[PDB]
Amino acid sequence: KHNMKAFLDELKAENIKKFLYNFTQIPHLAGTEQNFQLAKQIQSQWKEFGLDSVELAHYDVLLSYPNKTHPNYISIINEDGNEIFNTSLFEPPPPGYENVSDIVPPFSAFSPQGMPEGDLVYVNYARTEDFFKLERDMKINCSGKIVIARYGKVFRGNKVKNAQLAGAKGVILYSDPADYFAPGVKSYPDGWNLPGGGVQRGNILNLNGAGDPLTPGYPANEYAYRRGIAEAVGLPSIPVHPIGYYDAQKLLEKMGGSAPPDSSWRGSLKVPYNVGPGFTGNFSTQKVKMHIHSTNEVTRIYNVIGTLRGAVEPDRYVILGGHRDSWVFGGIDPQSGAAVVHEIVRSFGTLKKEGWRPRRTILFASWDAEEFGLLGSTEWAEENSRLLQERGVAYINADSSIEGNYTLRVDCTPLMYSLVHNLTKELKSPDEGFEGKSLYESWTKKSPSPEFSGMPRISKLGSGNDFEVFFQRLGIASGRARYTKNWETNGYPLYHSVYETYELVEKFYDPMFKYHLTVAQVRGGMVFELANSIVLPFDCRDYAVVLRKYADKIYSISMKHPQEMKTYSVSFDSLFSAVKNFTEIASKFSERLQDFSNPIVLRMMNDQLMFLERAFIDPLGLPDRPFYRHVIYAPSSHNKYAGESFPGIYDALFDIESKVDPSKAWGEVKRQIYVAAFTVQAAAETLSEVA
Ligand SMILES: *[C@@H]1O[C@H](CO)[C@@H](O[C@@H]2O[C@H](CO)[C@@H](O[C@@H]3O[C@H](CO)[C@@H](O)[C@H](O[C@H]4O[C@H](CO)[C@@H](O)[C@H](O)[C@@H]4O)[C@@H]3O)[C@H](O)[C@H]2NC(C)=O)[C@H](O)[C@H]1NC(C)=O
Ligand SMILES: CC[C@@H](C)[C@H](NC(=O)c1ccc(F)cc1)C(=O)N[C@@H](COP(=O)(O)N[C@@H](CCC(=O)O)C(=O)O)C(=O)O
Ligand SMILES: *[C@@H]1O[C@H](CO)[C@@H](O[C@@H]2O[C@H](CO)[C@@H](O)[C@H](O)[C@H]2NC(C)=O)[C@H](O)[C@H]1NC(C)=O
Ligand SMILES: *[C@@H]1O[C@H](CO)[C@@H](O[C@@H]2O[C@H](CO)[C@@H](O)[C@H](O)[C@H]2NC(C)=O)[C@H](O)[C@H]1NC(C)=O
Ligand SMILES: *[C@@H]1O[C@H](CO)[C@@H](O[C@@H]2O[C@H](CO)[C@@H](O)[C@H](O)[C@H]2NC(C)=O)[C@H](O)[C@H]1NC(C)=O
Ligand SMILES: *[C@@H]1O[C@H](CO)[C@@H](O)[C@H](O)[C@H]1NC(C)=O
Ligand SMILES: *[C@@H]1O[C@H](CO)[C@@H](O)[C@H](O)[C@H]1NC(C)=O
Ligand SMILES: *[C@@H]1O[C@H](CO)[C@@H](O)[C@H](O)[C@H]1NC(C)=O
Ligand SMILES: [Ca+2]
Ligand SMILES: [Cl-]
Ligand SMILES: [Zn+2]
Ligand SMILES: [Zn+2]
């Protein structure tokens, strides 16, 4: 029999392990020859695995690299201009990799060039609320200062935008052991903790979903007309550089000016965490100087696209995608996901060789340049947007399979909640103490839902990964699943460092590759069901439940301002009405879906299921973010990684007590309530009888 069990049983932990090892021996930085060679290898193997067609789709996009002969570094400089302390030029390479070439040194991708010299201000995590505290409460002025911020809590691009808007002239990012060193575990190579010389690479763009900075809206193909650099999307205006905590200690230890305002501003280093500006009395004339010489360069990137043509509905696409490019070895990010995809393709191909085909078409993708701003997935979706929005059933992401070994973590559209519950009840838990129990049971025990007993936590989709264009721009139902850590006893310390290797995973995270296998079963099982179930496995009623929860939430934010709501007649009545209607219509649609031999009624109904996520797209986009078009979910304006619900209303309400023209500010709240109520009602109406 060719069924989901046959698919799942064919997956092997040992294969995943072999693929991970194969993908992590050399760096695969976007735009480099090594990553093109890997793309060609994957294309060749997916063909031998049995896919119908496997092509490379290439684009020429803006990337960023350090200058090999003019290294980036930061100094403390004395009044004579002697550089008395220099940060490191590279991370000490791990055992047995000290002779590996082409390890990119730590840098912040897309930093402009410069050599700004100034007094430091310490800004905690450089969050919106951290800058509010400095500027509003502490009266500290960042204008013309070099800001030093600890990584953590929010996407680093948002930190840089926040620093830039505060008037900073440069930003130094560092990893504090409070956020990247778990008490009682040793530093790599003896444990999974970050050494003091370890440094997190990463881009600092604010693209808001645009893709390649030079071609927003359109694929960066051979004849593309590119913006000039000055009009490019999302580039920072000030130099930025990341350092480890050995170097951070040397920069912070001399800091003077005001004390930290409270303990939430103190990390774990033996320094006072003074905010500044500048250094204490004896060192008051020393300054900090950055030296950044990285260059932005249009560079070719390559996605691998594999197709397994559907037997019955070949014009319906279920997509499994994850990136291939890495900062260095990519032992977790992304190759622990890419090895899983590879094994999933292998299993589907085994079934195909025996005469099986899925009902719908399955597309498999190995995306390039994800680390430089989701560039590969976004350009390809821009090229294929018409096919995707008329034919795209679902997108399942497949980046890092593990960031811990504790329990499952799922982020998805509500349309997939029932699918995920049902699938995980049929899978075996890999956890110690749950042998013979279902993954649903272990997951539910370890990560209970905050609102429903006997159910697991499932989070919103945020952003910062390759599902963004499919979900937030095009409105295709999207999901992701990975193994995670237990937050309450404690993402991973060695993220984006040279120390993230095959050995890290094999020694400290998943020696038996059983968590990888469980993740392969969840991702692959989701894809199987989406591509094969007669009726698409989406339950519209789960969207109705969450819509009410988000409506309650946004109403409760607004209700902190009862006087203004009276003055400006701010009512949420239309939004609750739309949600009530969605609930009623979804319930009726569900009855018909179960009560309807008619392939036209079925496909009509499958089309209503597929276009339901699509109905939440507003073609005008959110304010000043034209590529975030989903009205229910957008990446938080303060942290790209986090999802925000009813983002247009949320952002209109945010910090509203500070706006100088309240009439105008509350008018825009009302406008966003109208947009949201209308979109919910329009989405509901796509589920009504069609004529
Ligand atoms: C949720 O679904 C319900 C349907 O079950 C839907 O109800 C509709 O509400 C609208 C807006 O309230 C109703 O509009 C009315 O329509 C009549 C004609 O049928 C008009 O005469 C009304 O206008 C008069 O009264 C207004 C209010 O006092 C005045 O402002 C106006 O100047 C007129 O004097 C009014 O337009 C509509 O009839 C119902 N439809 C039904 C019951 O079928 C509701 O709108 C849905 N929610 C959302 C958010 O869409
Ligand atoms: C660091 C541990 C990781 C498993 C990680 N991080 C977080 O969950 C997280 C949350 C808050 C935070 F401040 C840092 C990390 C995580 O999953 N991050 C995101 C980002 O993954 P990626 O590194 O592949 N994406 C790139 C590029 C993102 C973009 O350009 O939009 C990046 O974040 O630099 C994700 O997987 O969706
Ligand atoms: C990763 O695995 C691939 C595929 O098995 C290896 O590439 C093959 O290498 C052999 C021996 O050099 C060649 O004869 C094949 O033609 C290659 N096949 C391809 C590219 O499809 C590759 O050597 C492995 N890499 C590492 C680091 O182990
Ligand atoms: C930090 O690095 C800088 C740059 O390499 C060093 O300063 C240079 O020292 C050389 C040799 O003494 C001089 O010829 C250059 O003129 C200096 N360059 C600059 C830009 O000042 C500096 O010595 C290093 N500091 C420490 C403590 O190692
Ligand atoms: C998840 O599984 C449940 C339990 O089997 C499914 O709900 C059943 O669906 C069948 C087939 O239409 C109905 O006859 C039953 O009445 C349903 N039982 C319930 C709601 O308790 C549900 O459809 C599955 N979800 C999917 C496939 O997305
Ligand atoms: C790198 O280093 C120096 C800086 O001027 C120069 O010789 C070379 O052009 C630079 N490479 C670039 C800017 O791409
Ligand atoms: C902060 O610094 C500069 C002084 O160079 C000034 O122009 C700016 O208005 C100041 N802002 C505040 C809020 O003090
Ligand atoms: C793996 O699981 C064990 C048992 O809970 C835990 O002590 C260890 O910290 C885990 N490893 C990682 C990398 O989280
Ligand atoms: Ca583009
Ligand atoms: Cl993922
Ligand atoms: Zn990744
Ligand atoms: Zn990454």
State which H helix or E strand residue 270 sits in: none
* Ligand lying closest to the C-alpha of residue 25: 3
d(CA 299, CA 109): 14
Provide the pairing of β-strand 633-636 with 639-645.
Answer: antiparallel
Q: Distance, CA 239 to ligand 7 centroid (Å)? A: 20
Show the tokens assigned to 135: 């500027």
Is the Cβ–Cβ distance between 579 and 680 less than 8 Å?
yes
d(CA 591, CA 333): 43
The finding on whether 125 has its CB within 6 A of some atom of ligand 8 is no
- Cα radius of gyration rounded to whole Å, the chain: 25
d(CA 279, CA 69): 32
What is the DSSP track for 330-366? -TTTTHHHHHHHHHHHHHHHHHHHTT---SEEEEEEE
d(CA 325, CA 201): 13
Mention every residue, 6+ apart, whose C-beta is less than 8 A from residue 586.
540, 541, 543, 544, 684, 687
Task: Count Cβ neighbours within 10 Å for each residue of 217-228 and write b for 16 or more, e otherwise.
Answer: eebbeeebebee
d(CA 541, CA 533): 18
Closest CA to 622 of 672, 578, 664: 672
Mention every residue, 6+ apart, whose C-beta is less than 8 A from residue 327.
27, 29, 104, 201, 202, 333, 371, 496
Secondary structure letter of residue 656 according to DSSP: G
d(CA 313, CA 318): 11
Cis peptide before 334 (omega within 30 of 0): yes
How wide is the angle at C-alpha 229 spanned by C-alphas 224 and 234, nearest 5°? Answer: 95
3-state helix, strand, coil in the chain (%, to 5): 40, 20, 40
- Whose tokens are 């979804």? That residue is 586
At 277, which amino acid appears? P
What is the DSSP track for 249-317? HHHHTTB-BBPPSSGGG--SSSS----BSSB-GGGTT-EEEEEB--EEEEEEEEEEEEEE--SSEEEEE
State which H helix or E strand residue 669 sits in: helix 662-685
The finding on whether 419 has its CB within 6 A of some atom of ligand 5 is yes
Binding site residue list for Ca(2+): 215, 218, 379, 382
CATH no., domain 538-691: 1.20.930.40
Closest CA to 459 of 691, 642, 188: 642
Show the tokens assigned to 176: 């504090």
d(CA 235, CA 562): 40
Residues in the chain: 691
CATH no., domain 67-292: 3.50.30.30
Is the Cβ–Cβ distance between 517 and 12 less than 8 Å?
yes
List 56's β-bridge partners, or say none.
Answer: 304
Give the CA dihedral 584, 590, 593, 596, nearest 10 degrees.
Answer: -60
User: Where does ligand 3 bind, in terms of residues with CB under 6 Å?
Assistant: 22, 25, 41, 44-45
* Ligand lying closest to the C-alpha of residue 492: 2
d(CA 42, CA 34): 12
- SS3 for 6? helix
- SS3 for 322? strand
User: Please, how many CA atoms are within 13 Å of residue 455, restricted to the half-sphere of its CB?
Assistant: 14
Is the Cβ–Cβ distance between 172 and 239 less than 8 Å?
no
Show the tokens assigned to 370: 């994800």
Closest CA to 42 of 415, 325, 421: 325
- Of 188, 194, 406, the one to substitute when testing ligand 8's pocket (max ligand atoms within 8 A of C-beta) is 406
Give the active site residues: 370, 571, 607, 630
Experimental method: X-ray
Binding site residue list for Zn(2+): 323, 333, 371, 399, 496
Give Dmax (Cα) for the chain: 86
Binding site residue list: 156, 203, 215, 218, 323, 333, 370-371, 379, 382, 399, 463-465, 480-482, 495-496, 640-641
Residue 34 φ then ψ, to 5°: -60, -35
Cis peptide before 189 (omega within 30 of 0): yes
In this structure, which topology does domain 1-66+293-537 adopt according to CATH?
Aminopeptidase (3.40.630)
Neighbours of 101 (CB within 10 A): 7
The finding on whether 485 has its CB within 6 A of some atom of ligand 8 is yes
d(CA 349, CA 54): 13
d(CA 105, CA 643): 31
d(CA 4, CA 24): 30
CA 224 from centroid of its chain's CA atoms: 27
* Ligand lying closest to the C-alpha of residue 48: 3
Secondary structure letter of residue 687 according to DSSP: T
Is the Cβ–Cβ distance between 221 and 383 less than 8 Å?
yes
Is the Cβ–Cβ distance between 494 and 500 less than 8 Å?
yes
The finding on whether 143 has its CB within 6 A of some atom of ligand 7 is yes
Where in the chain are the domains? 1-66+293-537, 67-292, 538-691
Q: Strands, E, within 100-167: which ranges?
A: 108-109, 117-118, 120-122, 146-150
